[PDB]
């Protein structure tokens, strides 16, 4: 032929562990979670288009919205001064106030439509999630990222942001706020997972490796928390981390011992329950842990306030009542 198939990403890359340098053309999945400064910014194409769907929203009886992704909320912070100003010139007595992010970004059952108002913050019964919009933005085009109002109301994370890759038997599912690594050592299992957000949308199988023959009851990161339905989302001896410490919001999951503690495998151990932290509220360390039928190293999370263990890792001797847990 005479066609140059560089519709892709062209450049060079060096691998520290593999000890080679490779150039060429293809697909580059970058880690947009462990970046030092903000690589991507959310922006709306038309704030006035957004102002329409916000009036229209309250006219539908909607009191507020809950963000899907963290960058959506951070967009809502920079954007709220002008959204209230276009509202002021169009003289609607409805004020937009946006607060900060809880742990999980809970989903809401209402939605905006294309053409006081509380963005995020904590929960409230005066403006419940039943009346909050959620997942009504999709990506338009593009470092900057432009957003537009969505068509249909479904429960799936914006596919235009997701990515996955597998090579040299190391697998990755990635997001603006997720980074899930799996690897082949005897068997395929999850090894690390990084979170800047924890969302409540569904990971679309179109962006999932090995999405066949999965029992959701064995997915480590739960489906309801944007867990990918994949056999890479698997660890032998662990089941879904439904009650993991997802309330930390930003956390680091992996498989190793928490500092100063030990996990043993014993059938005498307690059943799997809500995740406990290794330090009491007073700062005491609980050194001896166990699990009934898990596989070492233990599933451990690390967050802003210390080290937590997977659901199946219980204290060996210490009574659970003295421990901080995630309910």
């Amino acid at each position, epitope marked *: 032929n005479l066609y140059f198939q560089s519709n892709a990403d062209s450049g060079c890359v060096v691998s520290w562990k593999n000890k080679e340098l490779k150039c060429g053309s293809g697909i580059f999945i970058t880690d947009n979670v462990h970046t030092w400064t903000e690589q991507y910014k959310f922006q709306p194409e038309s704030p006035s288009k957004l102002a329409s769907a916000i009036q229209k929203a309250h006219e539908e009886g909607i009191c507020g919205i809950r963000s899907v992704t963290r960058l959506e909320n951070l967009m809502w912070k920079q954007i709220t001064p002008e959204l209230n100003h276009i509202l002021s010139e169009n003289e609607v007595k409805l004020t937009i*106030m*946006t*607060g*900060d992010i809880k742990g999980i970004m809970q989903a809401g059952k209402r939605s905006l439509r294309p053409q006081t108002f509380l963005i995020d*913050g904590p929960e409230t019964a005066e403006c419940p999630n039943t009346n909050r919009a959620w997942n009504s933005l999709e990506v338009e085009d593009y470092t900057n990222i432009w957003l537009k109002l969505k068509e249909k109301q479904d429960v799936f994370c914006d596919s235009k942001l997701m990515s996955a890759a597998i090579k040299d038997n190391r697998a990755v599912h990635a997001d603006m706020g997720y980074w899930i690594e799996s690897a082949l050592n005897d068997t395929w299992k999850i090894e690390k997972a990084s979170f800047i957000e924890v969302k409540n949308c569904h990971w679309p199988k179109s962006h999932t490796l090995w999405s066949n023959g999965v029992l959701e009851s064995e997915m480590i990161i739960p489906k309801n928390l944007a867990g990918p339905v994949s056999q890479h989302n698997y660890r032998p001896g662990y089941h879904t981390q439904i009650t993991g410490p997802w309330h930390l919001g930003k956390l680091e999951m992996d498989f190793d011992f928490c*500092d*100063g503690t030990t996990v043993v495998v014993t059938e005498d151990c307690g059943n799997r329950g809500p995740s406990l932290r*290794t*330090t009491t*509220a*007073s*700062g005491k*360390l609980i050194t001896e842990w166990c699990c009934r039928s898990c596989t070492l190293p233990p599933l451990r999370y690390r967050g*802003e*306030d*210390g080290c937590w263990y997977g659901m199946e890792i219980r204290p060996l001797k210490e009574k659970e009542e003295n421990l*901080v*847990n*995630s309910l």
Partner: single-chain antibody
Amino acid sequence: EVQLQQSGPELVKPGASVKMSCKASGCTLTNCFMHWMKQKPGQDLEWIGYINPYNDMTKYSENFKGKATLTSDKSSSTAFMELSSLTSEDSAVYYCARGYLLRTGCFDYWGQGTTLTVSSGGNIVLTQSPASLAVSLGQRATISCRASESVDSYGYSFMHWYQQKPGQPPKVLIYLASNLESGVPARFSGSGSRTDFTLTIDPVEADDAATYYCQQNNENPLTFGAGTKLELK
């Protein structure tokens, strides 16, 4: 359980850098988070951040990210703090205290302080009431602390009370809203939940004249009250 030793006082020229140290004893990897706080002469305390020398885990409060740099030496288990470009607003007593991670413990044990002279939808705010309070021996002294947002997590109140005599580091009295720190006389008590807490001294005595601070560690940044100056009649 832990002993903190801060470096001597420093007199610096405006615009230059200064580095102060704190050496810890009785630490382990799991505790030993060395926190740093700033106190203008007779003022509230600002939380700068912490650094654990074994881990090199660090955190800064937003106000100080360009200003402070926290570094460590695992070998001696010593923390160092560097203070960028210096102005007269940086003159204060800078305390190094041992603490823990976010919703964890209180400032158990304290360094003696290093005195710095420069010459040639947000934070949780604690409001203390009253600003000053005068009382006689045998009476009941009541100091209250209002948090603008709940300081509760996991069924605990991450709220603490400290007493500070002049020219001295604070001392822990009440931790977790209501627990009597070991070695503190039972006449001190704390209570409350969510956003409303009260310290009570009953009966107040000759020794108890000091300034009383509430502090929270439910969310970063850590913040203090304005203080309550308690004085005898």
